[PDB]
Amino acid sequence: PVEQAVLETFFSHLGIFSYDKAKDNVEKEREANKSAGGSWLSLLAALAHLAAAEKVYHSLTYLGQKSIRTIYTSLHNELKKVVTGRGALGGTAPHVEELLSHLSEQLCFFVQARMEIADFYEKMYTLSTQKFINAEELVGLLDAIMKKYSSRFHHPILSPLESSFQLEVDVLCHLLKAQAQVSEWKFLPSLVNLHSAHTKLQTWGQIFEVQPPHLFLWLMKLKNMLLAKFSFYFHEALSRQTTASEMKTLTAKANPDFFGKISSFIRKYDAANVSLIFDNRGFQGHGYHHPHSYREAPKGVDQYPAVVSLPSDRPVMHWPNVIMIMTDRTSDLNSLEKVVHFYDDKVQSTYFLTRPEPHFTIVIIFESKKSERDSHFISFLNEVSLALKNPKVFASLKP
Amino acid sequence: MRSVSYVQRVALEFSGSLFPHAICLGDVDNDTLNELVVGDTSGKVSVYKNDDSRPWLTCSCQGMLTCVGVGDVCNKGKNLLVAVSAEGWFHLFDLTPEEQRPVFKQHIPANTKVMLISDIDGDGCRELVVGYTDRVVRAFRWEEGQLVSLKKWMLEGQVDSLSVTLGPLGLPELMVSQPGCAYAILLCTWDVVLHQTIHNKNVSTHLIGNIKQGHGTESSGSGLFALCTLDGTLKLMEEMEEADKLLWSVQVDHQLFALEKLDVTGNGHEEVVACAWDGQTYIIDHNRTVVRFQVDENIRAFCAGLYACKEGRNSPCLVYVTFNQKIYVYWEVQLERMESTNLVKLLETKPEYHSLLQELGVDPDDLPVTRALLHQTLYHPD
């Protein structure tokens, strides 16, 4: 196909970001390659405008407050009326002229899927104020687009974009599922989803040979925060398989490293403990367990497992008043923005506490009065919580 | 055909039961004088010597006795007493200068019934042959020492007696009685051939052999053997050449259970003596002359042979075992003759009588004349 020889390269150059270069061949075909069937120029202009549309898409700065719907949907008659059946003299012989019809239908499906994904991103942005991002609803909503659009464009000419699209879909799902699974303490499911996302990313990503569009950078940012979020939660089940001075070299390699902060803090200020509690949300144990094993149901004071407790084991003689305080003022901390304070006499401990996440809650303890007005500690807890909640992580989706 | 009444007799006390083959006579102390050896089931053997009613000596062996004998089994030029029990025990006694313990013991297979001591092959060493109730015959030899098994013959009918006789060729043989009045030749031990002779074929049969025929021929000579049946028939034949010539046979009306050889006349020939359960003893020579003797008593065991009873002298003797715990020994069974004759037909053989009658002028033709002459010569010397 001499006519499609140019089109093959023009479309295949879009696998990597080559929108500016892709435009140039269209300009050449517009007038230099004149006297042709009146569908080639139409599809050339359509693809040229598609290049700018996708550039705006990848920019992910064109949709913060809308536009990003009109320009998006500004090619439906274009794509559909690109083909016009047959008629008077056009371009080549009536042998491969009607090859663009399948591509046009696939591109109509492309446009529809892109618009729905854009509405998806806008919905996420709008929801990204709240007080906690329920990942289960987002997962329940995203599967619809993937299911409906799956296998809706194929004429062995559009594999790259599809793959890219697939990546742009597939990657996200895992992280959100991870974002889901981690919120509910799923060790292996979250880990597998995250690793599959990492593996799938590299090929369509790191193989670039310009600065990746903000969409890519936010994906990287989200994964990178998820790594540290993942690392903190399971640290007490990961310290076992290595050496105390060995895991430092890795835990210092997470961009928002949490482990170092508390260890430094205990040295900086004579303390008693620091712990992270996870109520069972209405539960095998530490690590991976059998496909179906005997799990004795939670009973007694066991819905409050100290998942992580930094210096030594959790004080037995100092955990009767942590599930007294936990429910004794169990209203304010559910607003996820305040920190509790109790100073007593015969325990001499000040139990600061904040709720970064609905299920999880951090706590410290001292050996004397702490003077709640002392902002030294409160700032640390605020700073710590500012990252776990993923408020900035969800918010920063458009520069 | 004529009856006799022996009077002289010795009674020996003996309490206990025994088999018919558990009594014998022979020299045990090596003094050329025979002594009686009797073994009972109770595990004791008594020897009787001379005329003492009490036994000379009692020797005890472990088990129940089934066979006794006296002979040269060790082949060291001496006579020894052999005792064989039912469990296949074997005891040797040297009663030659207070039970006498044996000086040897050896275990053989059990179910022993009959014993025999003779040189069967002819190597110069005497062999021991033992019969069994399960129709088995087993020969042995003394090896300097113990007993070495030789051969083991199998038979169909029950065995009742073992005998050795001079074969047609001139070598010793081995005869075994067989029911139905039959006998088997056993090939010597270095397979078994049968011969028949007319009634119920399950009748017990006893055999005897090695019958003497002349004086001084006991060193090496045989050829005649006798068969007896429980239904009451006797027979003498000769085992010469190919066919066994039939010498004689008699039919009686008693239950015959014994067969021995004796010498009552003293002319060298041996007479066959048989006994019945009721005690009707028969003595028959080789010339069809029967002599009857009725003891009028039920008899357990019988034994005819040489014995030293009075003043150290071997004489023919008959021995019966009675149910009254007694053993009867007749010692003067010697007979001047065996047929019946007179003076007239005994003087008609020597030629001197005829010569004297011719010299006297009286012709030995008128019986009354010679009868009167003999009467005058005997009862009227002057």
């Binding site: 597998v192 690392s231 390699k253 690590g287 991976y288 059998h290 | 039912a86 359960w277």
Partner: protein, 815 residues
């Protein structure tokens, strides 16, 4: 007034005669003494002053005055007085003229005087030969108060020795002071030549028709220098008639003189007490009467000894003398009391008809012994005649004595014995086995028509079988280490009983019974439910000994036995080690062990039931250099036992045996070749927990399951780079070098690594990679074929810890 004349020869005999006279008048007259006679007459007499007949012809006289009233017969009174005087004179003459006469260095002289007084040696005095006898016979015509007489005849005279002892014993019994002498006449002389004889000489006169005499004199020897004193203590009728004063005494000495002329006794008792003397005479007459009544040997023994039973029988009344019949000759004869103890006690006509064996106690004693021998024969004959009809027709526990009589009346026909092989010493519980054997044989014997013989109160058993010909008896007993049976016969045309004994002898079958019993016991012990034999019994040695003893398969047995030896290759492991392993895991191979007995060996047993019209119980037993160690030599036995029958078959290699042994050989070979691997696998598995070829050798035969087949969540691990596996291996090697058994290749183009936990010995977990092809894997290894799930707990912990580092490896690849 009357007077009587007296001879002058008694001129000085006045003191004696008067002494006699006072006695003589004392009898007829009851008290110059006054006497009263009852006509009634009073008599007063006074003596005054003045060849047998001359000396007593009736010179002092006697004057008497009698006052008679009524018919007193004065002439008769005078005659009586004269007779009394004459009798007194005769008595005095006899007393003083004959009684004092003797009957017949210093020590020797006194010895003859004693020998003459008692007179056993010497000669008789002339007085006691002719004079005395005639005198005492003559003073019997003249009425005197001291006289006796008796007479007898007897049918023979050999009774004399049989009367001479009885009479002296009798006289001694009635008179202590008496002695008897037996002076016999010398049979050449006569005029007082009486030669004393010794007590024991029987009859020293073989000559018949000889009129032997006897002089049986009896006198109290202590009556001399003694008639003055009281004598005999009232035994003598008289005493000194007058008075013993004035130094004069009458010879009141008594006497006794018996005499015989051929055959005629005659007593002459003098001075015996009247009643006692009359009783003495009566006793002698009765003694002779009894001796003569003891003449029936002559009648019905001596006569019948020569076939004369019809000529001289019993109670035939021999001789009809009408003197005083014969008290002992009555129809009621005490025959047994007259041939023994000759005395007058205080069919017989055919006695000796056809029986073969002091003459009185010599001729009938053999008759008594003959009559007793018949009773002894008769009792014995009834004792062996009631039993025959009792046992034959009727269908009582005969005692020991009856059994002994039956055995001594029977003949021994046949016997047989068998060997008891359970006892090692004959190569508490053995007694029980012997009792069971005996009981089973008793059952077999009663099943063929025999009746057990009970024994009433006073382990041998007796069984009988009554037949018209006679009684056949058996005896079962244990004698040492052998079981023996004896057969007795007792005949009661005459050859059918012999046939009956022969046929029963042919049905004995002891050897076949022992064969069946031994094989049945072997089978029962093989199951082990019937623990008859003692524990630790060497069954293989017992089987070998039994086969050696019966290597021919006794004729009418029903059970069968076979022995064979199996040699197996066993090339990999040692033969003895394989045998030990199979014995240890015998339960896994449908086999059972046996602890035969301080060395202990183990034998393998098995059994099943095969009914191929056979219905046979099948028993199988198996027991045990470098080439020898590579050869599994094991000898095995096959035992077949019947179910229904237990007794030897009455009528007359083995297909069942060969059929069983074929598949037995096949199954043994299959089991060996299958169990070799089951041992090889499990041997070095244990060694693993301490080689690469050894490591691969297991994986050929182990049940291993992939991680993708236990939990699908692990499926992600199946599709990642080998470098991740290398990282994993390094982490585990650093973490559990104790549990990590790393294996390499001498090309380093394949590695095997495993990790166990000691306690969970059931399964370890291995990784695998080739690094050339990239064929990396991951599996979990299970030695056994783990059966099922629903429709292992300690297994997932390996799947926990091992997977618990798989994620740690993943985490490091993301930080």
């Amino acid at each position: 007034v009357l007077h009587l004349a007296l001879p002058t020869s008694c001129r000085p005999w006045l003191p004696a005669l008067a002494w006699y006279l006072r006695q003589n008048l004392l009898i007829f007259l009851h008290s110059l003494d006054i006497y009263l006679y009852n006509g009634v007459a009073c008599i007063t007499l006074a003596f005054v002053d003045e060849e047998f007949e001359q000396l007593t012809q009736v010179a002092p006289r006697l004057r008497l005055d009698v006052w008679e009233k009524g018919n007193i017969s004065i002439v008769q009174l005078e005659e009586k007085l004269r007779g009394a005087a004459r009798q007194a004179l005769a008595d005095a003459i006899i007393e003083l003229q004959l009684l004092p006469a003797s009957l017949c260095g210093a020590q020797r002289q006194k010895r003859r005087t004693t020998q003459l007084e008692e007179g056993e040696v010497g000669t008789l005095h002339p007085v006691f030969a002719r004079v005395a006898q005639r005198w005492m016979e003559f003073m019997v015509q003249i009425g005197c108060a001291s006289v006796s007489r008796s007479s007898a005849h007897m049918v023979s005279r050999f009774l004399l020795p049989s009367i001479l002892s009885e009479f002296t014993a009798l006289v001694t019994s009635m008179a202590g002071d008496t002695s008897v002498r037996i002076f016999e006449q010398h049979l050449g002389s006569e005029p007082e030549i009486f030669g004393p004889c010794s007590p024991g000489q029987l009859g020293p006169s073989p000559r018949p028709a000889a009129e032997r005499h006897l002089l049986l004199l009896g006198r109290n020897f202590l009556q001399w220098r003694r008639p003055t004193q009281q004598a005999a203590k009232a035994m003598q009728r008289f005493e000194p008639g007058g008075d013993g004063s004035s130094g004069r005494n009458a010879p009141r000495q008594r006497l006794l003189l018996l005499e015989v002329v051929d055959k005629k006794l005659q007593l002459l008792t003098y001075n015996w007490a009247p009643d006692l003397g009359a009783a003495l005479g009566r006793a002698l007459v009765r003694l002779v009467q009894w001796q003569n009544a003891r003449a029936h040997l002559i009648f019905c023994l001596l006569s019948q000894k020569l076939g004369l039973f019809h000529h001289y029988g019993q109670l035939d009344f021999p001789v009809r003398d009408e003197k005083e019949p014969n008290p002992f000759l009555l129809p009621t004869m005490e025959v047994e009391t007259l041939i023994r103890s000759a005395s007058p006690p205080l069919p017989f006509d055919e006695a000796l008809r056809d029986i073969t064996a002091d003459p009185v106690t010599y001729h009938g004693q053999q008759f008594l012994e003959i009559k007793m021998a018949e009773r002894r024969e008769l009792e014995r004959q009834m004792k062996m005649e009631n039993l025959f009809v009792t046992w034959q027709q009727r269908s009582m526990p005969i005692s020991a004595g009856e059994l002994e009589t039956l055995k001594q009346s029977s003949r021994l026909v046949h016997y047989c014995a068998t060997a008891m092989l359970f006892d090692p010493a004959a190569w508490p519980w053995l007694k029980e086995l012997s009792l069971a054997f005996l009981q089973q044989y008793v059952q077999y014997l009663q099943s063929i028509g025999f009746v057990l013989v009970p024994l009433r109160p006073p382990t041998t058993y007796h069984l009988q079988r009554a037949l018209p010909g006679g009684i056949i008896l058996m005896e079962l007993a244990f004698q040492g280490c052998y079981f023996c049976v004896k057969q007795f016969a007792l005949e009661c045309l005459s050859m059918l009983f012999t046939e009956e004994c022969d046929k029963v002898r042919d049905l004995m079958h002891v050897h076949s019974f022992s064969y069946d019993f031994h094989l049945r016991l072997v089978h029962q012990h093989v199951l082990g439910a019937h623990l008859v034999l003692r524990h630790g019994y060497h069954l293989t040695t017992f089987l070998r000994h039994f086969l050696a003893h019966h290597p021919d398969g006794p004729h009418f047995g029903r059970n069968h036995i076979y022995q064979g030896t199996l040699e197996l290759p066993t090339p990999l492991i040692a033969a003895h080690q394989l045998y030990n392993y199979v014995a240890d895991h015998a339960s896994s191979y449908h086999m059972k062990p046996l602890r035969m007995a301080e060395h202990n060996e183990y034998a393998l047993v098995s059994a099943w039931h095969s009914s191929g019209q056979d219905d046979f119980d099948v028993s199988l037993l198996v027991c045990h250099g470098e080439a020898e160690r590579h050869v599994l030599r094991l000898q095995f036995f096959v035992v077949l036992t019947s179910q229904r029958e237990l007794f030897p078959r009455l009528t007359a290699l083995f297909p069942p045996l060969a059929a069983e042994v074929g598949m037995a050989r096949a199954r043994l070979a299959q089991l060996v070749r299958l169990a070799g691997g089951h041992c090889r696998r499990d041997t070095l598995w244990k060694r693993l927990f301490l080689a690469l070829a050894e490591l691969e050798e297991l994986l050929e035969a182990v049940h291993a399951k992939s991680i993708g087949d236990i939990d699908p969540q692990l499926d992600c691990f199946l599709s990642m780079t080998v470098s991740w596996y290398q990282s994993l291996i390094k982490v585990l090697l650093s973490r559990f070098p104790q549990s990590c058994r790393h294996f390499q290749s001498p090309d380093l183009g394949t590695q095997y690594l495993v990790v166990l936990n000691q306690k969970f010995t059931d399964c370890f977990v291995l990784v695998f990679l080739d690094s050339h092809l990239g064929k990396t894997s991951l599996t979990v290894v299970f030695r056994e074929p783990f059966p099922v799930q629903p429709q292992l707990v300690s297994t997932y912990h390996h799947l926990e810890s091992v997977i618990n580092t798989a994620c740690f490896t993943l985490w490091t690849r993301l930080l």
